[PDB]
Design an enzyme around this catalytic site. Structure first.
Site, PDB file in Angstrom:
ATOM      1  N   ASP A  72       0.839  -1.195   0.000  1.00  0.00           N
ATOM      2  CA  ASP A  72       0.000   0.000   0.000  1.00  0.00           C
ATOM      3  C   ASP A  72       0.876   1.247   0.000  1.00  0.00           C
ATOM      4  OD1 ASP A  72      -1.913   1.922   0.273  1.00  0.00           O
ATOM      5  OD2 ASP A  72      -2.446   1.404   2.346  1.00  0.00           O
ATOM      6  N   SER A 119      -0.425  15.587 -12.082  1.00  0.00           N
ATOM      7  CA  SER A 119      -0.644  15.216 -13.468  1.00  0.00           C
ATOM      8  C   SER A 119      -0.872  16.479 -14.297  1.00  0.00           C
ATOM      9  CB  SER A 119      -1.845  14.264 -13.554  1.00  0.00           C
ATOM     10  OG  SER A 119      -2.233  14.002 -14.890  1.00  0.00           O
TER      11      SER A 119
END
Length: 330
Positions: A35, A199
């Protein structure tokens, strides 16, 4: 040193991935959910409330000659999906894919919430976010990657998750046969303890690319792709009959649909998520309403590049003094 381990989807939807981990002496092998959005290595154990164990493999520290109670240490964690677990702490030897850390904090669960009990395939979590998020008190503990870093050939790990197929976690090296083209690296903020990056935009299907900054986290422990409501609405508007359902808890679409791809920007590079990766199947057995793999982050507080996005790429988690993320097509 290096390590290399195969990671395997837990079910036919890729809801999560499990990676075998050796703990203790002699080794006890548990299948952990790696994770990159949390920083605790915790396991089902001989200390877990018996009624909360349903098929998981447990760690029994009393059977490990290298286990030592970390005296006074406790841990307690809550995840973004509302699940939680807590307990006490041992140190022990932990190996992943041939890479060994001695003295790793192994957080032994005394209590786990229902979603963990109900998932017999996940024996615990191995956190790979920054150690500043580790919950052990009163002495915060380091992640497996943080403990291994100095010994690694290069201070990196990579995530290569498969679509409906196994993939690989590598530690300490970049497998140049595992991706196509070049790796594009992008800056990371560690201020919230995550692999947080920006992004450069998105496209829906064959549509034009929209240049826009989307701050979010690379999170292998989250199944889906969670993005701003504007972006998600633009995606689902291209699917006839798709709608946001408050009763189901997100966007659903007709199971008869063919989904468009979704592209996200990494600097000037582009990662394409095929439409099929966005299908999470019927909302309930036999339903013709299917659950979408791109959902709004509006209720979370952060955008999450979960498995739907990451499995379309070869992803480098660069833990150099100034961390960065790398993405390549594959």
């Amino acid at each position: 040193s290096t390590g290399s381990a195969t990671t395997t989807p837990i079910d036919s939807l890729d809801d999560a991935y499990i990676t075998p981990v050796q703990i203790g002496t002699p080794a006890q092998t548990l299948n952990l959910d790696f994770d990159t959005g949390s920083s605790d290595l915790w396991v089902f154990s001989s200390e877990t409330t018996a009624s909360e164990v349903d098929g998981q493999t447990i760690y029994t520290p009393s059977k490990s000659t290298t286990a030592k109670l970390l005296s006074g240490a406790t841990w307690s964690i809550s995840y973004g999906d509302g699940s939680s677990s807590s307990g006490d702490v041992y140190t022990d030897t932990v190996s992943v894919g041939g890479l060994t850390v001695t003295g790793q904090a192994v957080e032994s669960a005394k209590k786990v919430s229902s979603s963990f009990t109900e998932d017999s395939t996940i024996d615990g979590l191995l956190g790979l976010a920054f150690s500043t998020l580790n919950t052990v008190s009163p002495t915060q503990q380091k992640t497996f990657f943080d403990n291994a870093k100095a010994s690694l050939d290069s201070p990196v790990f990579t995530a290569d998750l498969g679509y409906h197929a196994p993939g690989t976690y590598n530690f300490g090296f970049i497998d140049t046969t595992a991706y196509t083209g070049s790796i594009t690296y992008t800056a990371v903020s560690t201020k919230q303890g995550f692999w947080e990056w920006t992004s450069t935009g998105y496209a829906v299907g064959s549509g034009t690319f929209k240049s826009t900054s989307i701050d979010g986290i690379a999170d292998t422990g989250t199944t889906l792709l969670y993005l701003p409501a504007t972006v998600v609405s633009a995606y689902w508007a291209q699917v006839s009959g798709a709608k946001s359902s408050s009763s189901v808890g997100g966007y659903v679409f007709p199971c008869s649909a063919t989904l468009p791809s979704f592209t996200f920007g990494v600097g000037s590079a582009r990662i394409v998520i095929p439409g099929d990766y966005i299908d999470f199947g019927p909302i309930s057995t036999g339903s013709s309403s299917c659950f979408g793999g791109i959902q709004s982050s509006a209720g979370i507080g952060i955008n999450i590049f979960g498995d739907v996005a990451l499995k379309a790429a070869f992803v480098v988690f660069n833990g150099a003094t100034t961390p960065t993320l790398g993405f390549a097509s594959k």
